[PDB]
Design a protein around this nucleic acid. Structure first.
Ligand SMILES: [Mg+2]
Ligand SMILES: [Mg+2]
Lengths: 50, 50, 277, 251, 1340
DNA sequence: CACGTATGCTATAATGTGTGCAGTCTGACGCGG
DNA sequence: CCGCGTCAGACTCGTAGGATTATAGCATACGTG
RNA sequence: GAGU
């Protein structure tokens, strides 16, 4: 985003800063739930071949 | 590659238990293949001693 | 390439010509007199009728093709029992056979546990009656409401409705989530746990020890007669015949041995009394 | 099998086999009746369809479905994939002498110990308790021993305490990514329902106590007990097998 | 302020005047289902819509037909209460009036033949409760609204499909609400194709041929014209200046007498404008230029009458010369350009294998019904029945509307069937997009995602039930007799009833209401799901849709959605958001005219919002003038930046509208990371209600609204004075001004006592009024399970200190004081339900007797004669609750038992033992029992005792009803009689039974007496019939499942105290498990002596960035400090005046406190009740982004004489010495979550095993073993622990012989392994052989 | 003989299926035209 | 090559049970107490 | 729905 968040957590974010934060946060959290399958599948193939 | 290397082991129980099991079993059934149970996979499946 | 079973079959039936009345009569005269061709031509020409009827009866019995085959079987009965001399048309006669045969088939194969026709037809009248009842009683019908309508026993109605209890698949997963199903919960009740099995070992072995406490004669009489340490529960004559002629003496020694066991129990029964659970 | 309520529950295979049998026996009938060839054909195709469904359902075309809409589970489906025999029931198994609970910290614990709830341990070591009861002469028979443990008598607690001494138990946390996700400890019996885990091995388990749970397993045999104390004990397994570094580090 | 607010006012730190109040929170649910049952006369809605959609229907023959007249819902035979108890669905019978009309075949349409009209029942439809739930089989269930792709048109394109080429292939999709999909797409060669329901691909022009378009016409539609006049000898072309652009001039372009461009020269702007200004129309050109221009129309030689050139054909020198000499000196060619006007359809016609219309219909037919012989009939029928039949295709109003606006039309509403124009226009726009003008849409945009509430879904399933029955109807009409056959004999209720029951039951969206907390219910009902029928799959879901979309602003919360696989798809509604009439989401905004911010509010849809620039709520207003600052922070086109004041069109209504309801309850949300706040809001839903409903000191304000709107609290319908308070009920007498002149005007509310929730929690309503209190309308009379005086009370605030402590708070682990347990504040109630079923078996019936083989007198003491435990009785695991016995069949008694039963005599009885007992290690008190017997089975003695209770209690309830109604009714007549003939005490002397004979003069008041007299008798006869109904229902023998003779339900209540292993948390996503309960002596304590309640680890703050918890703690301590000052003042009893001075100063502290709260209006006693409540701690409201600032909080701490740091000197309880530095101490409001260790602890040695695989079962409820999975096996492999592994594979799992042998060895000390082969392996082989593969073991 | 289970026959003419959903997932690796 | 097909896609824990439809009516025949 |  072109506009960054000038505030900090002690200062407290406004509506727009908070909203802007959400996207990245959630992207990360989704990655935990969903991508661990593919990581783990790698683990499984390695295990099987060794 | 790791996937094919595991499917290339002489042990068809190891191969079949890994993946591709319909294909692995047609291959082995036609070949008349025998597994003498050298690998750990194979032993664990029959509940034997590693 | 159309590899649809259905489409292939329907195409092939299509390419046989529909018959007129005079044609049917001529063919059929020879069919009763045995003309392999005649019967075949009548069958093949009238397959399209079968499909029209099986189309209706399908719905929820069975696969369309399954219905079609049974329908064909009905049509064959019709060609065998057709009367050309009677002025009544063939299609009219065949319709009866086809519908009959399809319905009867969907009454024996439609249920995993095969219900006899008698039970099935009983049950159906209970059903149709329930529907009329619900049409005037707004709310669904009770067992006794249906029974009151038929002037019959409630137990009759209930047993029929119990049979209508349809099957559950062991593989169908529970909780929407395709995880664990019925098989995943369902135990083997017949197979006792090693706890129960080991308790019986302990029981049986404590009885050996208790039997050895008694006299050699009492213990042997009890062992042979109960079939405990022996193989077969030898009758009084068998045990007596092998030891002491007196069949009556087997009863004497046996009853004596039971009473000595009771004494051990009144003395050391403090362990035995706990075998009552 | 019959459910309690008078329902019956069956395998999908029975439905598939009923299709095959009916179609095959109809074919025999059609042949006895010397039927026209088009009907013979339809039935032969029918037969092939049902067999194909029986062996591998959703392979050739539309999988034959139940009233649920869902495709019936054929023979091949029982061997094939995760729900399959191999993956689900053979390479990994349900296990007896296994328990689970919430975990919490045990700062007081030494490295080779873990807090094991009394109630849990009483059940996990059931047969060991009965055997010792018979050596104490406390329990006359197995039925008596059972009823004695149900009643949870004070002598039973002394016996339980006796047995668990020097007996290693395995703690596991999911997902088990490396071998240190399963480690052995000497149990310390505690009154209260959570397992207490030693702080320093929280690293290896990736365990944080925001409600995490762990599984407990009882090595039964002299051989398994030895395996646990020698190979799997937390004190013995410090270093990461991946890099040569101590995995137990203060945090 | 209201009367209930006079009791306790919350302190507001908000600064923004709230222009709009929060709406009814459960709007969605109720409005929707209201519309479904609402019988709309013209504009069909819900049910009405379903009937008109299907009906009227006629027979296959066409002579007989059924038509729909009207429907009515019967009132439900059992009310909600009874439904919950019995386990029945709360529904209304659906009776529908239908008319069977028959036509004559001899007359043309002889409608006057046979007309039979009657009312047919067909299914009961479940009704929605007062609070938006349904009662299905005695449990509350909520159907969650769905979010799907709106019907309409949508243009998309995979950005570089073939990654090799990387060419962008655009597509159109028309998505109807019901029908086949119609797709248009480009291929790499720029040819336009069509597919139906993604079948195989067809040239796009083939569909236009189906619509009867000749080639000439098709070109005329998509292409423009270039005209060529052939004059004298030289060729002339008709020119439009602004075509020849970005091109290279191939020949020397000249006009009249001015040469503009030469051969091989670029035609820029200048040239075009020159030419246009000069007015050039015809230009002489070379004949050789024509070769390659495509002719548009056909030209024939008028002489010969043969084709010189067919349409869409490339022109050449010969064709042109031939055309000239035939007599055509003007030739329409296609305008086309590689860059702007792309020749797509031209190329697609060359690929089109069809010729005429009929040929096009055949190809269409042959795609979707391949192989099958086409007939013209069939082809025509198919194509019409795809998108041009009323029956099978319907965009719906929404589809047509969205489609028309996407095509830039004027008219919103219209036909749900596709017209020819519609199709062409979609192709055209697709082609426009390809040329470069226009853009493609996105699916995640809320303008393309629509919300589908319960009513519409019920409507859909109901249509399906109708359609099933329709099949049956048509088939039976055909064969049926015209005269004997009644309409209701053809209709079956079962299909419809099945389809609907299946929806509210089998559907994913319909689920057990989450009711472990008022908030939980309210947010659950405000949920939206992208899953379910007609939606996305967890496995089929990408990450695009999941992540937070720009349009979600004000509509959907960005901070409320589960961290599971359901991460993107399940979402809670934003606060102020609402469902548009067509189904899109919309958010309120305040209109700004000329800079001036009007109080008119407009709800903007997603699409509308992009068009305007919207200022943020945080802009500072100039006291109803305009924006103070010249630069204003606003947003439009989904992106944010600075604007001028007069530029601003709208502004956000509330600072809260960005967030959902749950998130709004989080104070200092502004200081928390969104990730943590997600967890915080989610975990707040899981808070279990404690014994004592404690309000939260540091709140937000949404507390009051949630509690009241949830409906769990009893609220007052009409204001007035409370006539009778009770634990069990509340009777309030209404004020004259609100009190209707008909009835007595006394409202009666029975309160629902100790009842079981779906999560086995305890739902009890307490009264929060005093006897004889004047109460205002819409005040809280009684608090629900987690509410306190109208406010939401999910947990309990307490004194917390942040510091490490001996590792007992290691990784979020929590050290709590014994004090908290002693005071039983976290202690919770759980009501569990145990049932004993007596079924009729093949052998004979099971009996519910207390006569059971081998039972102790100790056990039978608590069981009555019938075999049922007494009410009140305290039970512990193993105790028998309901005695039951079952008939055992023959069993071959082992010779040992033959010998033993001969020894003891004691022949074992015919009966076994199936008694229901207390589940092991749960223990509680039996608080209620309920018996269900069939209609005819001889009742238990206990069942009769229960019925005695119910009958006599029912009589009391109804008797009190007529008593207090008769008393309130005569009290009115007494007042009416005074208005005219006042004789107050002289009228009361002789009996009240002889009162209504007294009249008045013939005036309006004499008529008032007639009205009270008529109602009094009405109530008299009504009371008779009500009680008869009550008596029937109590006597009513219950219809249970077939086979079940009788069922006994026991309700236990269990008191669970907190312990180590339990889970606790705040509202900032700060979790923890209790590690240790410390004695009070050991707890850190302040200088004053007051010990802390909880010690949390401060190491879980910096990393986490949930700073809300810290501010919450500081403000919490200040809240308590003021509470202690008020409490000190109350103990001393200074006087009203002094209390009032302090309290006024306190309320009005903040810099720009919005709320003023003047204590001069409060009377002295009102001040006393208020202070009494505030002594515990002054409750404070920090709104979401409009919260209390650090400055304001520190000023509040100074009013408490507390430190500015909010850190205090604490002493170690064990040593007495102080900690090295100050510790942050205050009150955090904490929750006990549903995850009790009691429910999670589990252990198993040996038990039941699985049916086929023989391995132990799973799950604690089935007494399962843990799974040692592939991952877990690998661990042991790594270690090399071979025997432990083998042990788990064999003796511990399948190996049957092994397990039993191993058990006996273990009991005999010797820990020997005796392993064999896992039975599951055996089974594998058998499965393979049933496959027809020979798999054999070759032995040694 | 009776009870439970089964097979059987019926005569206006009727003579080619559809139906109820599926929602489009993805990056990879082979296999006929 | 293109295009259609087939194949894979983390580990433990949980919750709750459960759905639908409908097959005419009667006469004769066969096997067991 | 719980911890990754
Ligand atoms: Mg952590
Ligand atoms: Mg954790």
């Amino acid at each position: 985003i072109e506009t960054p968040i000038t505030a900090n957590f002690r200062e407290g974010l406004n509506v727009l800063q908070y909203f802007i934060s959400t996207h990245g946060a959630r992207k990360g959290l989704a990655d935990t739930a969903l991508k661990t399958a593919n990581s783990g599948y790698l683990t499984r193939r390695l295990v099987d071949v060794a | 590659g790791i996937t094919k290397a595991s499917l290339a082991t002489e042990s068809f129980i190891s191969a079949a238990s890994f993946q591709e099991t319909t294909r692995v079993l047609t291959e082995a059934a036609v070949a008349g293949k025998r597994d003498e149970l050298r690998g750990l996979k194979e032993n664990v499946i029959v509940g034997r001693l590693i | 390439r159309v590899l649809d079973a259905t489409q292939l079959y329907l195409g092939e039936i299509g390419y046989s010509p529909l018959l007129t009345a005079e044609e049917e009569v001529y063919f059929a005269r020879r069919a009763l007199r045995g003309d392999v061709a005649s019967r075949r031509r009548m069958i093949e020409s009238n397959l399209r009728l079968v499909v029209k009827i099986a189309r209706r009866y399908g719905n929820r019995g069975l696969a369309l093709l399954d219905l079609i085959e049974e329908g064909n079987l009905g049509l064959i009965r019709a060609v065998e029992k057709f009367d050309p001399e009677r002025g009544f048309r063939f299609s009219t006669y065949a319709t009866w056979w086809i519908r009959q045969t399809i319905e009867r088939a969907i009454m024996n194969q439609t249920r995993t546990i095969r219900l006899p026709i008698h039970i099935v037809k009983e049950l159906n009248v209970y059903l149709r009656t329930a529907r009329e009842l619900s049409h005037k009683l707004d709310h669904e019908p009770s067992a006794e409401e249906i029974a009151e309508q038929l002037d019959k026993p409630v137990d009759d109605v209930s047993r029929m409705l119990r049979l209508n209890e349809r099957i559950t698949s062991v593989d169908t997963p529970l909780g929407g989530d395709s995880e664990k199903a019925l098989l995943d919960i369902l135990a083997d009740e017949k197979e006792n746990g090693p706890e129960d099995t080991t308790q019986d070992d302990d029981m049986k072995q404590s009885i050996v020890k208790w039997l050895f406490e008694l006299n050699a004669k009492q213990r042997e009489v009890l062992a042979r007669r109960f079939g405990l340490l022996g193989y077969e529960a030898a009758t009084l004559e068998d045990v007596g015949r092998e030891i002491g002629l007196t069949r009556e003496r087997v009863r004497q020694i046996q009853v004596e041995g039971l009473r000595r066991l009771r004494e051990i129990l009144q003395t050391q029964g403090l362990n035995i009394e706990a075998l009552f659970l | 099998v019959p459910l309690d309520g008078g329902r019956f529950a069956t395998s999908d295979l029975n439905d598939l086999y009923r299709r095959v049998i009916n179609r095959n026996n109809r074919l025999k009938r059609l042949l006895d009746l010397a039927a026209p060839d088009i009907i013979v054909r339809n039935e032969k195709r029918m037969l092939q369809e049902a067999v194909d469904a029986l062996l591998d359902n959703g392979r050739r075309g539309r999988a034959i479905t139940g009233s649920n809409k869902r495709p019936l589970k054929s023979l091949a489906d029982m061997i094939k994939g995760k729900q399959g025999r191999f993956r689900q029931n053979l390479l990994g198994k349900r296990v007896d002498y296994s328990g689970r609970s919430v975990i919490t910290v045990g700062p007081y614990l030494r490295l080779h110990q873990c807090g094991l709830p009394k109630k849990m341990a009483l059940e996990l070591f059931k047969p060991f308790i009965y055997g010792k009861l018979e050596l104490r002469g406390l329990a006359t028979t197995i039925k008596a021993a059972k009823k004695m443990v149900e009643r949870e008598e004070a002598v039973v607690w002394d016996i339980l305490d006796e047995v668990i001494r020097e007996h290693p138990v395995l703690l596991n946390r999911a997902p088990t990514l490396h071998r240190l996700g399963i480690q052995a400890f000497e149990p310390v019996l505690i009154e209260g329902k959570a397992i207490q885990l030693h702080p320093l091995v929280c690293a290896a388990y990736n365990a944080d106590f925001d409600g995490d749970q762990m599984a407990v397993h009882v090595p039964l045999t002299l051989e398994a007990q030895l395996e646990a104390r020698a190979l799997m004990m937390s004190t013995n397994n410090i270093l990461s097998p991946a890099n040569g570094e101590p995995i137990i580090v203060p945090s | 302020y209201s009367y209930t607010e006079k009791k306790r006012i919350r302190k507001d730190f908000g600064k923004r005047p709230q222009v709009l109040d929060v709406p009814y929170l459960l709007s969605i649910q109720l409005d929707s289902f209201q519309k479904f049952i609402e019988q709309d006369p013209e504009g069909q809605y819900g049910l009405e819509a379903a009937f008109r959609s299907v009906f009227p229907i006629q027979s296959y023959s066409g002579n007989s037909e059924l038509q729909y007249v009207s429907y009515r819902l019967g009132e439900p035979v059992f009310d909600v209460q009874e439904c919950q108890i019995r386990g029945v669905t709360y529904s209304a019978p659906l009776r529908v009036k239908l008319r069977l009309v028959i036509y004559e075949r001899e007359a043309p349409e002889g409608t006057v033949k046979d007309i039979k009209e009657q009312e047919v029942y067909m299914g009961e439809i479940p009704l929605m409760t007062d609070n938006g739930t349904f009662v299905i089989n005695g449990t509350e269930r909520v159907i969650v609204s769905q979010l799907h792709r709106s019907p309409g048109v949508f243009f998309d394109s995979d950005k570089g499909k073939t990654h090799s080429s990387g060419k962008v292939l655009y597509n159109a999709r028309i998505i109807p609400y019901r029908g086949s999909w119609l797709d248009f797409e480009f291929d790499p060669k720029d040819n336009l194709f069509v597919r139906i329901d993604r079948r195989r691909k067809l040239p796009a022009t083939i569909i236009l041929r189906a619509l009867n378009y000749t080639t000439e016409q098709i070109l005329d539609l998509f292409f423009e014209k270039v005209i060529f006049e052939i004059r004298d000898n030289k060729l002339q072309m008709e020119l439009v200046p602004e075509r020849l652009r970005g091109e290279t001039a191939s020949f020397d372009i000249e006009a009249n007498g001015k040469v503009y461009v030469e051969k091989g020269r670029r035609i820029t702007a200048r040239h075009i404008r020159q030419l246009e200004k000069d007015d050039v129309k015809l230009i002489e050109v070379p004949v050789e230029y024509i070769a390659g221009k495509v002719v548009a129309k056909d030209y024939i030689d008028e002489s010969t009458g043969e084709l010189i050139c067919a349409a869409n054909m490339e022109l050449s020198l010969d064709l042109l010369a031939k055309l000239s000499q035939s007599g055509h000196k003007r030739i329409e060619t296609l305008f086309t350009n590689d860059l702007d006007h792309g020749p797509y359809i031209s190329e697609t016609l060359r690929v089109d294998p069809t010729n005429d219309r009929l040929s096009a219909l055949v190809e269409i037919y042959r795609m979707m019904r391949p192989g099958e012989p086409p007939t013209r009939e069939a082809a025509e029928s198919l194509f019409e029945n795809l998108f041009f039949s009323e029956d099978r295709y319907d965009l719906s109003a929404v589809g047509r509307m969205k489609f028309n606006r996407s095509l830039l039309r004027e008219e919103i509403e219209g036909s749900g069937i596709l017209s020819k124009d519609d199709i062409i226009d979609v192709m055209k726009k697709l082609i426009d997009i390809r040329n470069g003008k226009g853009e493609v849409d996105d699916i995640d945009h809320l303008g393309n995602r629509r919300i589908r509430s319960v009513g519409e879904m019920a409507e859909n399933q109901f249509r399906v039930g109708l359609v099933r029955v329709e099949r049956a109807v048509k088939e039976r009409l055909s064969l049926g007799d015209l005269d004997t056959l009644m309409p209701q004999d053809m209709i079956n209720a079962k299909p419809i009833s099945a389809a609907v029951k299946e929806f509210f039951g089998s559907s994913q969206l319909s689920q057990f209401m989450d009711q472990n907390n008022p908030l939980s219910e309210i947010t659950h009902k405000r949920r939206i799901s992208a899953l379910g029928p007609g939606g996305l799959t967890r496995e089929r879901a990408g990450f695009e849709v999941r992540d937070v979309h720009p349009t979600h602003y004000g509509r959907v919360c960005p901070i409320e959605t589960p961290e599971g696989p359901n991460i993107g798809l399940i979402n809670s509604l934003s606060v102020y958001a609402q469902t548009n009439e067509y189904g899109f989401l919309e958010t309120p905004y305040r209109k700004v005219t000329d800079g001036v911010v009007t109080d008119e509010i407009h709800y903007l849809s997603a699409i509308e919002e992009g068009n305007y620039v919207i200022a943020q709520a945080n802009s500072n207003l100039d006291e109803e003038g305009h924006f103070v600052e010249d630069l204003v922070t606003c947003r439009s086109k989904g992106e944010s930046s600075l604007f001028s004041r007069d530029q601003v069109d709208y502004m956000d209504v509330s600072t809260q509208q960005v967030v959902s309801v749950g998130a709004s309850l989080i104070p200092f949300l502004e200081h928390d990371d969104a990730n943590r706040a997600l967890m915080g809001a989610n975990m707040q839903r899981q808070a279990v209600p404690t014994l004592r409903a404690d309000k939260p000191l540091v709140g937000t304000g949404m507390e009051r609204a949630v509690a009241v709107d949830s409906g769990v609290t009893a609220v007052a319908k009409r204001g007035g004075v409370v006539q009778y308070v009770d634990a069990s009920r509340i009777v309030i007498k209404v004020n004259e001004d609100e009190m209707y002149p008909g009835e007595a005007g006394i409202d009666i509310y029975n309160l629902t006592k100790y009842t079981r929730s779906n999560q086995n929690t305890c739902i009890n309503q307490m009264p929060c009024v005093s006897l004889g209190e004047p109460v205002e309308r819409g005040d809280v009379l009684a608090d629900g399970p987690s509410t306190d005086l109208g406010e939401l009370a999910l947990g309990q605030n307490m004194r917390v200190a942040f510091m490490p402590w001996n590792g007992y708070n290691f990784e979020d682990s929590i050290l709590v004081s014994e004090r908290v347990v002693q005071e039983d504040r976290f202690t919770t109630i759980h009501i569990q339900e145990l049932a004993c079923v007596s079924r009729d078996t093949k052998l004979g019936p099971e009996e519910i007797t207390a006569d059971i083989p081998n039972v102790g007198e100790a056990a039978l003491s608590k069981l009555d004669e019938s075999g049922i435990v007494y009410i009140g009785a305290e039970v512990t695991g193993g105790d028998i609750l309901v005695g039951k016995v079952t008939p055992k069949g023959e069993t071959q008694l082992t010779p040992e038992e033959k010998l033993l039963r001969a020894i003891f005599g004691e022949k074992a009885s015919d009966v076994k033992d199936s008694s229901l007992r207390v589940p092991n290690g749960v223990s509680g008190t039996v608080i209620d029992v309920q018996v269900f017997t069939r209609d005819g089975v001889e009742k238990d003695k206990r069942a009769l005792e229960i019925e005695e209770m119910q009958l006599k209690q029912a009589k009391k309830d109804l008797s009190e009803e007529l008593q207090i109604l008769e008393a309130g009714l005569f009290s009115r007549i007494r007042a009416v009689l005074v208005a005219g003939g006042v004789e107050a005490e002289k009228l009361d002397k002789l009996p009240r039974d002889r009162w209504l004979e007294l009249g008045l003069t013939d005036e309006e008041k004499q008529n008032q007496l007639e009205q009270l007299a008529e109602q009094y008798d009405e109530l008299k006869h009504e009371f008779e019939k009500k009680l008869e109904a009550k008596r029937r229902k109590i006597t009513q023998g219950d219809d249970l499942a077939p086979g079940v003779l009788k069922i006994v339900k026991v309700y236990l209540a269990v008191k669970r105290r907190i312990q180590p292993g339990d889970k606790m948390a705040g509202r900032h996503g700060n979790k923890g498990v209790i590690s240790k309960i410390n004695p009070i002596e050991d707890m850190p304590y302040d200088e004053n002596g007051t010990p802390v309640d909880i010690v949390l680890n401060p190491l879980g703050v910096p990393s986490r960035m949930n700073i809300g918890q810290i501010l919450e703690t500081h403000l919490g301590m200040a809240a308590k400090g003021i509470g202690d000052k008020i409490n000190a003042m109350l103990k001393q009893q200074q006087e009203v005046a002094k209390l009032r001075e302090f309290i006024q100063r306190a309320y009005d502290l903040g810099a720009d406190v919005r709320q003023k709260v003047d204590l001069s209006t409060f009377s002295d006693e009102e001040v006393m009740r208020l202070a009494e409540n505030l002594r515990k701690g002054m409750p404070i409201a920090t709104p979401v982004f409009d919260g209390a600032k650090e400055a304001e909080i520190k000023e509040l701490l100074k009013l408490g004489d507390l430190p500015t740091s909010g850190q205090i000197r604490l002493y170690d309880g064990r040593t007495g010495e102080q900690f090295e530095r100050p510790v942050t101490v205050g009150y955090m409001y904490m929750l006990k979550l549903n995850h009790l260790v009691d429910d999670k602890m589990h252990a198993r040695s040996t038990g039941s095993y699985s049916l086929v695989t023989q391995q132990p079962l799973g799950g604690k409820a089935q007494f399962g073993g843990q799974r040692f999975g592939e991952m877990e096996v690998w661990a042991l492999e790594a270690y090399g622990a071979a025997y432990t592994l083998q042990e788990m594979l064999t003796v511990k799992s399948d190996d049957v012989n092994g397990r039993t042998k191993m058990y006996k060895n273990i009991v005999d000390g010797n820990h020997q392994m005796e392993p064999g082969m896992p039975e599951s392996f055996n089974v594998l082989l058998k499965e393979i052989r049933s496959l027809g593969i020979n798999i054999e073991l070759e032995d040694e």
